[PDB]
C-alpha cells in the first residue's frame, strides 16, 4: 500500500537511527524512533552546548512554513533531561510530509555523555498522547487522520547487524517481514505501548507484570528484586566500572525468557540477549538485561525482543501485534 517505509540503519554497536527532515528546505536529521517517548526534538541551531558541536542543528529562518512558538519547555528522559522550546514546522518521513509541533533544543549537556557518544541528533516519539509533554497527537494518529495513510499503526522490523537493515513501516502490515501468524495483546493502558503479560525468566518468575515495548532502548529490564533472584541463579559478574553484567556464553544450562499471554506465549532464547564481550572469542558474554525500578511490576522490551519478533503497533485497534520476523 501507499505504506510509507522508513529505513532504520544500524551503527557499529547495536542501536539504529532513521533519516528525518523538517521543513521546506528539508533539513535532514538522524533521529531515533522511540515508542517510549511521545515527543519530537531536534537540536536547534540556537544551541551551543558542546553536545550540539558535532551535531546536526535545525535552523528556522531557512524555511518558510516555520510557524513560531517559542513556548519554553523540557523533557526528562530516563537517561537525562533536555531544554528548549516548542516550534511548529514541516516534518517529513520520507514518502510522507506533514506540518508538526516539535521541540527546538537548546540546552542538552546532561543527556551527556551519551548525547555525543551516540550517532544521533533527535528523537521522534511513538507513544500515546498522554505520554507526551504538551499533549501532542502521535504523528501516525495524525496522518491516518488527514487520510494520508491507510490506518493508524506502525511496524518495527528488526534484523541483526552485519546482516541487514531495520525497517519502520507506517500504514500497514507487510508480510515481507514475518513468519507464522500474528498474535496480539491489548494495551493495559494508552500511555506507553504497555500490555499485561506473565513473565518467567527461566526459573524465577513474576505474574501479571506490566511490560512495554521500547524501540528506543537497547536493553531489557525488570525490577531489581526480580533480577537478583535470576542473576544469582546463573552466577553473573558485575564489574563496577563497566555498566553491564558479563557471563559465559556457552553456559551449559541456558534459560529462555518467557512472556505469557492468556493464550499466547512469547519466548526469548539466550542468544537474543547476549553478546560476546570481545569479539575474538565467545567465552564471556555481555547480557542485555538490567535492573531498573520503574514500578514494581514494570518491564521493558527493547531491540532484543524486536530483533526476534516483528512487532506491530495499532493505534485504533488499541493493541499490539507480535510475530516472528523473517530472519
Ligand atoms: C531502559 C531504561 C530505563 C531507565 C532509564 C534509561 C533507560 C534507557 N533508555 C533508553 O534507551 C532511551 N529512552 C527510551 O527508551 C525511552 O523510551 C524511555 C524509556 C523509559 C520508560 C520508563 C522509564 C524510564 C525510561 N522513556 C522515557 O524517556 C520517558 C518515559 C515516560 C515519559 C517521558 O516523558 C519519557 C521521556 C529514553 S532516551 C534513552 C536513550 C535514555
Short mmCIF file of C-alpha atoms and ligand atoms in Angstrom, two decimals:
data_model
loop_
_atom_site.label_atom_id
_atom_site.label_comp_id
_atom_site.label_asym_id
_atom_site.label_seq_id
_atom_site.Cartn_x
_atom_site.Cartn_y
_atom_site.Cartn_z
CA UNK A 1 0.00 0.00 0.00
CA UNK A 2 0.90 3.76 0.00
CA UNK A 3 2.59 2.46 3.27
CA UNK A 4 5.40 4.88 3.97
CA UNK A 5 8.62 3.00 4.53
CA UNK A 6 11.37 4.41 6.78
CA UNK A 7 14.74 2.82 6.80
CA UNK A 8 16.38 2.16 10.12
CA UNK A 9 20.13 1.99 9.75
CA UNK A 10 22.22 0.46 12.49
CA UNK A 11 25.62 1.55 13.67
CA UNK A 12 28.65 -0.17 14.85
CA UNK A 13 27.11 -1.21 18.14
CA UNK A 14 23.51 -2.26 18.04
CA UNK A 15 21.40 0.88 18.01
CA UNK A 16 19.60 2.22 14.94
CA UNK A 17 18.72 5.68 13.73
CA UNK A 18 16.45 6.83 10.84
CA UNK A 19 16.59 9.80 8.47
CA UNK A 20 14.32 12.72 9.36
CA UNK A 21 13.67 16.05 7.70
CA UNK A 22 11.96 19.15 9.00
CA UNK A 23 10.87 22.00 6.82
CA UNK A 24 10.61 23.28 3.22
CA UNK A 25 14.31 23.17 2.74
CA UNK A 26 14.07 19.58 4.11
CA UNK A 27 16.87 19.72 6.68
CA UNK A 28 17.98 16.11 7.32
CA UNK A 29 18.35 14.59 10.76
CA UNK A 30 19.33 11.32 12.35
CA UNK A 31 16.58 10.73 14.86
CA UNK A 32 15.58 7.76 16.98
CA UNK A 33 12.18 6.33 16.61
CA UNK A 34 11.07 5.56 20.08
CA UNK A 35 7.83 4.00 21.41
CA UNK A 36 8.94 5.18 24.82
CA UNK A 37 8.64 8.89 24.45
CA UNK A 38 5.92 10.82 22.70
CA UNK A 39 7.57 13.95 21.58
CA UNK A 40 9.88 15.14 18.94
CA UNK A 41 13.00 17.25 19.16
CA UNK A 42 15.95 18.28 17.11
CA UNK A 43 19.00 20.10 18.43
CA UNK A 44 18.38 23.67 17.27
CA UNK A 45 20.93 25.83 15.65
CA UNK A 46 20.40 28.24 18.54
CA UNK A 47 22.26 25.69 20.70
CA UNK A 48 25.92 25.85 21.61
CA UNK A 49 26.37 23.06 24.12
CA UNK A 50 29.41 21.05 23.21
CA UNK A 51 26.96 18.16 22.55
CA UNK A 52 25.48 20.16 19.67
CA UNK A 53 29.05 20.94 18.38
CA UNK A 54 29.30 17.69 16.48
CA UNK A 55 25.60 17.52 15.77
CA UNK A 56 23.15 18.35 13.01
CA UNK A 57 21.36 21.50 14.13
CA UNK A 58 17.96 22.88 12.98
CA UNK A 59 17.66 26.44 11.69
CA UNK A 60 14.39 28.10 11.14
CA UNK A 61 14.79 31.21 9.08
CA UNK A 62 15.73 28.84 6.26
CA UNK A 63 12.23 27.62 5.93
CA UNK A 64 9.04 29.42 5.46
CA UNK A 65 6.48 27.12 6.79
CA UNK A 66 8.18 27.52 10.07
CA UNK A 67 5.38 28.78 12.26
CA UNK A 68 6.70 30.36 15.57
CA UNK A 69 6.00 29.25 19.15
CA UNK A 70 8.89 29.71 21.49
CA UNK A 71 6.89 28.46 24.48
CA UNK A 72 9.78 27.17 26.59
CA UNK A 73 9.68 23.55 27.75
CA UNK A 74 11.64 20.39 28.80
CA UNK A 75 11.71 16.64 28.84
CA UNK A 76 13.26 14.34 31.43
CA UNK A 77 14.06 11.04 29.79
CA UNK A 78 15.29 8.05 31.70
CA UNK A 79 18.94 8.95 30.97
CA UNK A 80 18.83 12.74 31.06
CA UNK A 81 16.90 15.99 30.55
CA UNK A 82 16.61 18.48 27.69
CA UNK A 83 15.55 22.17 27.37
CA UNK A 84 14.41 24.40 24.52
CA UNK A 85 11.10 25.48 23.07
CA UNK A 86 8.21 24.37 21.04
CA UNK A 87 8.23 25.27 17.37
CA UNK A 88 5.91 24.09 14.64
CA UNK A 89 7.29 23.38 11.09
CA UNK A 90 7.04 20.77 8.35
CA UNK A 91 8.03 17.33 9.44
CA UNK A 92 8.50 14.71 6.78
CA UNK A 93 9.11 10.99 6.91
CA UNK A 94 10.48 10.05 3.53
CA UNK A 95 7.33 9.30 1.44
CA UNK A 96 5.10 11.46 3.66
CA UNK A 97 5.30 15.11 4.81
CA UNK A 98 3.30 17.00 7.46
CA UNK A 99 3.34 20.28 9.47
CA UNK A 100 4.02 19.33 13.11
CA UNK A 101 4.91 20.53 16.61
CA UNK A 102 8.33 19.75 17.92
CA UNK A 103 10.90 21.00 20.38
CA UNK A 104 13.79 23.12 19.26
CA UNK A 105 16.51 22.01 21.59
CA UNK A 106 18.90 24.42 23.15
CA UNK A 107 20.38 23.11 26.37
CA UNK A 108 21.50 19.46 26.37
CA UNK A 109 24.66 18.70 28.24
CA UNK A 110 23.28 16.08 30.55
CA UNK A 111 21.95 13.58 28.26
CA UNK A 112 25.57 13.83 28.32
CA UNK A 113 27.94 11.71 27.95
CA UNK A 114 25.67 9.93 25.83
CA UNK A 115 24.50 12.64 23.63
CA UNK A 116 27.81 12.99 21.65
CA UNK A 117 28.85 9.36 22.13
CA UNK A 118 25.71 8.37 20.15
CA UNK A 119 25.20 8.63 16.42
CA UNK A 120 22.01 10.67 16.84
CA UNK A 121 20.51 14.09 16.64
CA UNK A 122 16.91 13.83 17.72
CA UNK A 123 14.08 11.67 18.86
CA UNK A 124 10.73 11.12 17.44
CA UNK A 125 8.46 9.55 19.99
CA UNK A 126 5.87 6.96 19.04
CA UNK A 127 3.90 6.65 22.25
CA UNK A 128 0.36 7.73 23.10
CA UNK A 129 -0.73 11.34 23.58
CA UNK A 130 -0.78 11.28 27.39
CA UNK A 131 2.89 10.29 27.34
CA UNK A 132 3.84 13.48 25.65
CA UNK A 133 4.70 16.79 27.16
CA UNK A 134 2.36 19.46 25.84
CA UNK A 135 -0.26 16.99 24.72
CA UNK A 136 0.60 16.32 21.15
CA UNK A 137 -1.12 13.93 18.87
CA UNK A 138 1.07 10.98 17.80
CA UNK A 139 2.06 11.63 14.18
CA UNK A 140 0.66 8.30 12.98
CA UNK A 141 -2.66 9.02 14.65
CA UNK A 142 -2.46 12.30 12.76
CA UNK A 143 -1.64 11.06 9.28
CA UNK A 144 -4.36 8.44 9.25
CA UNK A 145 -6.46 11.40 10.38
CA UNK A 146 -5.52 13.60 7.40
CA UNK A 147 -6.10 10.41 5.37
CA UNK A 148 -2.54 10.27 4.08
CA UNK A 149 -2.08 6.62 5.09
CA UNK A 150 -4.35 3.57 5.33
CA UNK A 151 -4.55 3.22 9.10
CA UNK A 152 -3.04 4.29 12.39
CA UNK A 153 -0.27 1.82 13.08
CA UNK A 154 3.45 1.42 12.74
CA UNK A 155 5.68 -1.64 12.43
CA UNK A 156 9.10 -2.26 13.71
CA UNK A 157 11.06 -4.74 11.69
CA UNK A 158 14.41 -5.75 13.09
CA UNK A 159 17.19 -7.94 11.76
CA UNK A 160 20.65 -8.22 13.25
CA UNK A 161 23.93 -6.42 12.39
CA UNK A 162 26.31 -7.12 9.52
CA UNK A 163 23.22 -8.92 8.26
CA UNK A 164 20.81 -6.28 7.00
CA UNK A 165 18.70 -3.24 7.79
CA UNK A 166 15.99 -2.12 10.19
CA UNK A 167 12.60 -1.05 8.92
CA UNK A 168 9.96 1.16 10.35
CA UNK A 169 6.75 0.95 8.38
CA UNK A 170 3.76 3.26 8.79
CA UNK A 171 0.30 2.39 7.46
CA UNK A 172 0.42 -1.40 7.06
CA UNK A 173 1.48 -4.93 7.86
CA UNK A 174 3.93 -6.13 5.27
CA UNK A 175 4.23 -9.88 5.28
CA UNK A 176 7.63 -9.49 3.68
CA UNK A 177 8.70 -9.15 7.32
CA UNK A 178 7.40 -12.05 9.39
CA UNK A 179 6.88 -15.80 9.67
CA UNK A 180 3.90 -17.60 11.12
CA UNK A 181 0.66 -15.96 12.13
CA UNK A 182 0.44 -12.75 14.32
CA UNK A 183 -0.92 -12.69 17.84
CA UNK A 184 -1.96 -9.54 19.58
CA UNK A 185 -2.10 -8.16 23.03
CA UNK A 186 -4.35 -5.34 24.04
CA UNK A 187 -2.79 -2.47 25.76
CA UNK A 188 -3.47 -2.37 29.52
CA UNK A 189 -3.25 1.42 29.05
CA UNK A 190 -2.77 4.02 26.38
CA UNK A 191 0.34 5.59 27.60
CA UNK A 192 3.29 3.51 26.59
CA UNK A 193 2.58 0.54 24.46
CA UNK A 194 2.04 -1.36 27.66
CA UNK A 195 0.45 -4.79 27.91
CA UNK A 196 -0.28 -7.33 30.65
CA UNK A 197 1.90 -10.46 30.46
CA UNK A 198 3.10 -13.23 32.80
CA UNK A 199 6.79 -13.43 32.76
CA UNK A 200 9.38 -16.06 33.55
CA UNK A 201 12.98 -15.52 33.50
CA UNK A 202 13.89 -19.14 33.25
CA UNK A 203 13.27 -20.30 36.84
CA UNK A 204 12.43 -17.14 38.74
CA UNK A 205 9.08 -15.60 37.83
CA UNK A 206 6.53 -12.86 38.30
CA UNK A 207 2.92 -12.98 37.36
CA UNK A 208 0.80 -10.28 35.68
CA UNK A 209 3.64 -7.87 35.07
CA UNK A 210 3.41 -4.68 33.04
CA UNK A 211 5.53 -4.89 30.04
CA UNK A 212 6.38 -2.42 27.42
CA UNK A 213 7.90 -2.30 24.18
CA UNK A 214 10.56 0.26 23.70
CA UNK A 215 12.03 0.73 20.29
CA UNK A 216 14.31 3.38 21.80
CA UNK A 217 16.42 1.35 24.27
CA UNK A 218 18.76 -1.46 23.54
CA UNK A 219 18.14 -3.37 26.72
CA UNK A 220 15.65 -5.44 28.60
CA UNK A 221 14.88 -4.55 32.12
CA UNK A 222 12.99 -5.63 35.19
CA UNK A 223 12.60 -4.84 38.87
CA UNK A 224 15.87 -5.30 40.65
CA UNK A 225 14.40 -7.72 43.15
CA UNK A 226 13.23 -9.91 40.27
CA UNK A 227 16.71 -9.83 38.83
CA UNK A 228 18.74 -10.61 41.88
CA UNK A 229 16.99 -13.93 42.16
CA UNK A 230 17.76 -14.59 38.45
CA UNK A 231 21.25 -13.29 38.18
CA UNK A 232 22.39 -15.16 41.27
CA UNK A 233 20.90 -18.33 39.64
CA UNK A 234 23.41 -18.24 36.72
CA UNK A 235 26.17 -16.56 38.67
CA UNK A 236 26.76 -13.30 36.74
CA UNK A 237 29.60 -10.85 37.22
CA UNK A 238 29.03 -7.16 37.67
CA UNK A 239 32.29 -5.35 37.24
CA UNK A 240 31.86 -1.93 38.82
CA UNK A 241 33.15 0.45 36.14
CA UNK A 242 31.54 -1.39 33.28
CA UNK A 243 27.71 -0.94 33.25
CA UNK A 244 26.80 -4.50 32.05
CA UNK A 245 26.76 -7.91 33.64
CA UNK A 246 29.10 -10.34 32.00
CA UNK A 247 28.89 -14.13 31.89
CA UNK A 248 29.84 -17.25 29.93
CA UNK A 249 28.00 -17.56 26.66
CA UNK A 250 28.21 -21.36 26.27
CA UNK A 251 26.65 -21.58 29.77
CA UNK A 252 25.72 -25.22 29.93
CA UNK A 253 22.22 -24.64 31.22
CA UNK A 254 20.67 -21.72 29.24
CA UNK A 255 17.34 -20.32 30.20
CA UNK A 256 14.94 -18.71 27.88
CA UNK A 257 12.76 -15.74 28.69
CA UNK A 258 9.01 -16.41 28.82
CA UNK A 259 6.32 -13.88 28.17
CA UNK A 260 2.86 -15.35 28.58
CA UNK A 261 -0.42 -14.00 27.27
CA UNK A 262 -3.58 -15.69 28.35
CA UNK A 263 -3.28 -17.84 25.14
CA UNK A 264 -0.02 -16.73 23.50
CA UNK A 265 3.47 -17.35 24.60
CA UNK A 266 6.49 -15.30 23.65
CA UNK A 267 10.00 -16.59 24.31
CA UNK A 268 13.47 -15.22 24.05
CA UNK A 269 16.34 -17.68 23.71
CA UNK A 270 19.68 -16.99 25.42
CA UNK A 271 21.21 -15.90 22.14
CA UNK A 272 18.82 -12.93 21.81
CA UNK A 273 20.08 -11.32 24.99
CA UNK A 274 23.75 -12.00 24.99
CA UNK A 275 26.79 -10.72 23.21
CA UNK A 276 30.35 -11.89 23.10
CA UNK A 277 32.31 -9.27 25.00
CA UNK A 278 35.10 -9.26 22.98
CA UNK A 279 34.77 -10.07 19.55
CA UNK A 280 37.62 -12.56 19.13
CA UNK A 281 36.33 -15.33 21.38
CA UNK A 282 32.94 -16.44 22.65
CA UNK A 283 33.88 -17.34 26.22
CA UNK A 284 32.44 -14.35 28.06
CA UNK A 285 29.27 -12.57 27.23
CA UNK A 286 27.61 -9.32 27.96
CA UNK A 287 23.90 -9.55 28.93
CA UNK A 288 21.22 -7.13 27.73
CA UNK A 289 19.30 -7.32 30.98
CA UNK A 290 19.47 -4.59 33.60
CA UNK A 291 17.72 -3.88 36.82
CA UNK A 292 15.57 -0.78 36.71
CA UNK A 293 12.89 0.25 39.18
CA UNK A 294 10.06 1.94 37.33
CA UNK A 295 7.34 0.31 39.13
CA UNK A 296 7.18 -2.91 40.92
CA UNK A 297 5.71 -4.83 38.05
CA UNK A 298 7.10 -2.95 35.05
CA UNK A 299 9.41 -4.38 32.49
CA UNK A 300 10.77 -3.02 29.23
CA UNK A 301 11.39 -4.79 25.95
CA UNK A 302 13.88 -3.15 23.62
CA UNK A 303 15.67 -4.20 20.49
CA UNK A 304 16.49 -7.64 21.83
CA UNK A 305 12.89 -8.73 21.51
CA UNK A 306 12.18 -6.91 18.23
CA UNK A 307 15.29 -8.43 16.77
CA UNK A 308 13.32 -11.68 17.06
CA UNK A 309 9.71 -10.52 16.80
CA UNK A 310 8.38 -8.32 14.09
CA UNK A 311 6.16 -6.14 16.14
CA UNK A 312 3.03 -4.28 15.19
CA UNK A 313 1.51 -1.27 16.94
CA UNK A 314 -2.08 -0.42 16.20
CA UNK A 315 -3.43 2.85 17.48
CA UNK A 316 -7.16 2.30 16.58
CA UNK A 317 -7.01 -1.38 17.34
CA UNK A 318 -5.65 -0.11 20.69
CA UNK A 319 -3.29 -3.04 20.69
CA UNK A 320 -0.01 -4.50 19.61
CA UNK A 321 0.75 -7.39 17.35
CA UNK A 322 3.51 -9.85 17.69
CA UNK A 323 5.04 -12.32 15.28
CA UNK A 324 8.42 -13.89 14.39
CA UNK A 325 10.38 -11.90 11.88
CA UNK A 326 11.97 -13.01 8.61
CA UNK A 327 15.48 -13.96 9.90
C1 LIG B 1 15.65 1.27 29.83
C2 LIG B 1 15.96 2.49 30.66
C3 LIG B 1 15.38 2.55 31.93
C4 LIG B 1 15.63 3.65 32.72
C5 LIG B 1 16.46 4.67 32.27
C6 LIG B 1 17.03 4.62 31.00
C7 LIG B 1 16.78 3.53 30.18
C8 LIG B 1 17.44 3.54 28.83
N1 LIG B 1 16.74 4.49 27.98
C9 LIG B 1 16.86 4.46 26.63
O1 LIG B 1 17.47 3.58 25.97
C10 LIG B 1 16.31 5.63 25.85
N2 LIG B 1 14.93 6.07 26.16
C11 LIG B 1 13.84 5.32 25.99
O2 LIG B 1 13.86 4.19 25.64
C12 LIG B 1 12.52 5.92 26.33
O3 LIG B 1 11.55 5.06 25.79
C13 LIG B 1 12.42 5.95 27.84
C14 LIG B 1 12.17 4.55 28.37
C15 LIG B 1 11.75 4.66 29.81
C16 LIG B 1 10.48 4.29 30.19
C17 LIG B 1 10.11 4.37 31.52
C18 LIG B 1 11.00 4.82 32.46
C19 LIG B 1 12.29 5.18 32.09
C20 LIG B 1 12.66 5.10 30.76
N3 LIG B 1 11.25 6.68 28.28
C21 LIG B 1 11.30 7.91 28.57
O4 LIG B 1 12.46 8.54 28.45
C22 LIG B 1 10.05 8.61 29.03
C23 LIG B 1 9.04 7.88 29.62
C24 LIG B 1 7.85 8.47 30.08
C25 LIG B 1 7.65 9.82 29.94
C26 LIG B 1 8.66 10.57 29.34
O5 LIG B 1 8.41 11.93 29.27
C27 LIG B 1 9.85 9.95 28.89
C28 LIG B 1 10.93 10.75 28.27
C29 LIG B 1 14.92 7.47 26.60
S1 LIG B 1 16.27 8.17 25.75
C30 LIG B 1 17.29 6.81 26.08
C31 LIG B 1 18.39 6.72 25.04
C32 LIG B 1 17.78 7.16 27.51
#
